[PDB]
Design a binder for this molecule. Structure first.
Ligand SMILES: Cc1ncc(COP(=O)(O)O)c(/C=N/[C@@H](CCCNC(=N)N)C(=O)O)c1O
Ligand SMILES: N=C(N)NC[C@@H](O)CC(=O)C(=O)O
Lengths: 369, 367
């Protein structure tokens, strides 16, 4: 009855032991609370300055924070959207003007698949081993108009390394295909902080990148998706963007600027340390527990997959929910073959440690019948 | 090209009277809310979002007379904007509906979002929509009838008896009735209970409410997508493909601005818009060839008609004096020449830059 992962996440939104959706719900740091305390000042600034200047500063702060020095800073090359999913809707509807089929990494967050399919695009799954380990086949590239990679991936944390991004961008250029990247989880893993725009521009392929500020910091879902596109993209992303919105709030852009600056001043290292700590408490707690394993040993992402033998993720979810703990079954990340995820749940790590600890102790007991 | 692309040219300019968003100064009661934003933040971290959301919806719907709205969780879908609501609706229509009857003129992204999602449009002129039943031929040929009320740019309000009849006609033809009520807060004639009428007629229906145009909240807002239990369209599914929900801080802000409005802010807003409308009309009163096509509009946008000049020529001349209005062609999404001789002026502005802007227009029109 839960048609997608988001509908599983609705069930958790009002519980103290929500470890389902990937949004950041941990406490603000002291430096971040100082930003919140200055919100009336940021409001006045947002009333008094031209939005283009605030937007330019927010983009500069965020892209430079994460190593993306080559981003196109000319006004209009980075489209600020209400969310990365709104960017994805724009991209999907734009793709459907001239593309029939999209090669898409599998598993990935399911609304990428569902927005693409919903706009009439046929999807070809590319498993992670194929995507990272070998060139894509000429047969595949000639049959699709776009290759879409989430990196770091959700739910696996896998990062497309620079050499492979380069080869993929070269392949797309050679075939005329759009390379599209979703880099929502970029901030969590320094392996994703090499300059992606430099690679893409040097390869000369048609490209689109959707950045997202929404997953890094606990900003009560105040965020923007940033839809960045090559000059030759050849899709009507600018026109469809303008059908949907005039722009985002200057106050949100100012918040993104301030949170990015705090992150540059040591907040980002603290975040990495915090996620590492929370991953450690989860793995320590599901220690022995016969039948339990962690499919993504090297992930640095803010979500964590847990696998179990002889139990189903939906079953674990129901036993968990009877104790008011809400996680996420993994089936629907495997948008082309949901049974691939039948024996996994996903746990959200962007949480205060104490509620996370309590939820994982509950899972330890459950997983011990 | 669309109206939004004209609006981008004005966005960083002092004499922007183009887009309809609210850009006047906060009232003192509203500035008090902004001063307490750190408290609203703490509330949003601590309380379940469902409680804040229910309170925001209750405050906003009751403020505007919509007491029969479906208050069960999940019947009102909070979206980042009304245009996001409209994208969800357009996409949800496109599998089962080929043709939509749409009020003409209206704001052009309604037409562009519908067309962009594969729907063919059939214009319905305002005098026909309000003045008489729709024909059986039209209603049997369309899967949805879409009415903006109060309309943008005309301010025209669908009266209760005509809404009732339209909903009855849509029910008897199996047609979805969709309303965009984004400008509801401005005109008390739109504060009779629309949900009572829709539920009583028993057609399949969708209403898109919008908080964005009423208050100067730096574009912090929600579109509210409300639907009948039997709508038969994938609005809930496609909504969930796009978002988990809106920020609890924005919902708390809507609740507080709605409460301020219920305490007298809404009366003050109506008096403020009436004052700015009076400024425009007094300023242009005696100019040769100018008329006001919508004398009873209470909307926050104002149409100005002039003979012997195209709204495009007038826009061009204003732009040289750094004033940005809107040519009206593109609101007439089926027949753009219908709007060749009008421009639209935004009234949700501090009175001082509005007066400065209207003074340029007066002198441009007099010379
Ligand atoms: C009747 C009606 N229904 C919905 C909306 C969307 O409101 P939103 O912008 O989503 O908050 C509007 C917008 N009216 C403004 C701003 C247009 C901004 N451009 C795009 N949205 N593409 C205007 O008339 O200038 C409307 O009139
Ligand atoms: N439909 C949407 N946008 N659902 C939100 C989810 C957030 C996410 O991506 C995650 O929980 O990992």
């Amino acid at each position: 009855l839960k048609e997608n992962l988001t509908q599983w996440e609705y069930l958790a939104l009002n519980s103290e032991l929500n470890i389902a959706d990937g949004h950041a719900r941990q406490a603000l740091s002291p430096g971040q609370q100082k930003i919140v305390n200055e919100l009336p000042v940021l409001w006045a600034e947002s009333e008094q300055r031209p939005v283009q200047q605030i937007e330019s500063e927010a983009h500069q702060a965020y892209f430079t924070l994460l190593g993306q020095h080559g981003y196109p800073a000319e006004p209009g090359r980075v489209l600020s959207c209400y969310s990365s999913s709104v960017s994805m809707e724009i991209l999907a509807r734009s793709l459907s003007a001239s593309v029939d089929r999209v090669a898409l990494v599998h598993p990935t967050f399911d609304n990428i698949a569902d927005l693409l399919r919903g706009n009439g695009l046929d999807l070809v799954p590319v498993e992670e081993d194929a995507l990272h380990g070998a060139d894509l086949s000429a047969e595949l590239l000639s049959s699709v108009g776009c290759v879409f990679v989430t990196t770091p991936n959700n739910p696996t944390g896998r990062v497309l390394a620079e050499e492979r991004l380069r080869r993929l961008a070269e392949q797309c250029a050679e075939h005329g295909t759009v390379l599209a990247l979703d880099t929502s989880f970029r901030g969590f893993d320094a392996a994703a902080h090499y300059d992606h725009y430099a690679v893409l521009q040097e390869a000369g392929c048609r490209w689109v990148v959707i950045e997202d500020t929404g997953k890094l910091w606990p900003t009560l879902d105040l965020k923007a998706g940033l839809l960045v596109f090559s000059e030759d993209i050849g899709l009507p992303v600018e026109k469809i963007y303008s059908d949907i919105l005039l722009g985002v709030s200057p106050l949100i852009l100012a918040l993104i600027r301030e949170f990015s600056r705090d992150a540059a001043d040591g907040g980002l290292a603290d975040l990495h340390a915090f996620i590492l700590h929370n991953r450690s408490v989860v793995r320590r707690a599901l220690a022995g527990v016969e039948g339990v394993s962690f499919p993504d040993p090297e992930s640095r992402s803010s979500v964590e997959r847990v696998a179990f033998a002889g139990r189903t993720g939906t079953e674990v979810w129901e036993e968990l929910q009877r104790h008011h703990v809400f996680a996420l079954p993994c089936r629907q990340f495997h948008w082309a073959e949901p049974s691939d995820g039948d024996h996994m749940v996903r746990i959200a790590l962007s949480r205060s440690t104490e509620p996370l600890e309590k939820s994982v102790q509950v899972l330890r007991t459950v997983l011990e019948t």
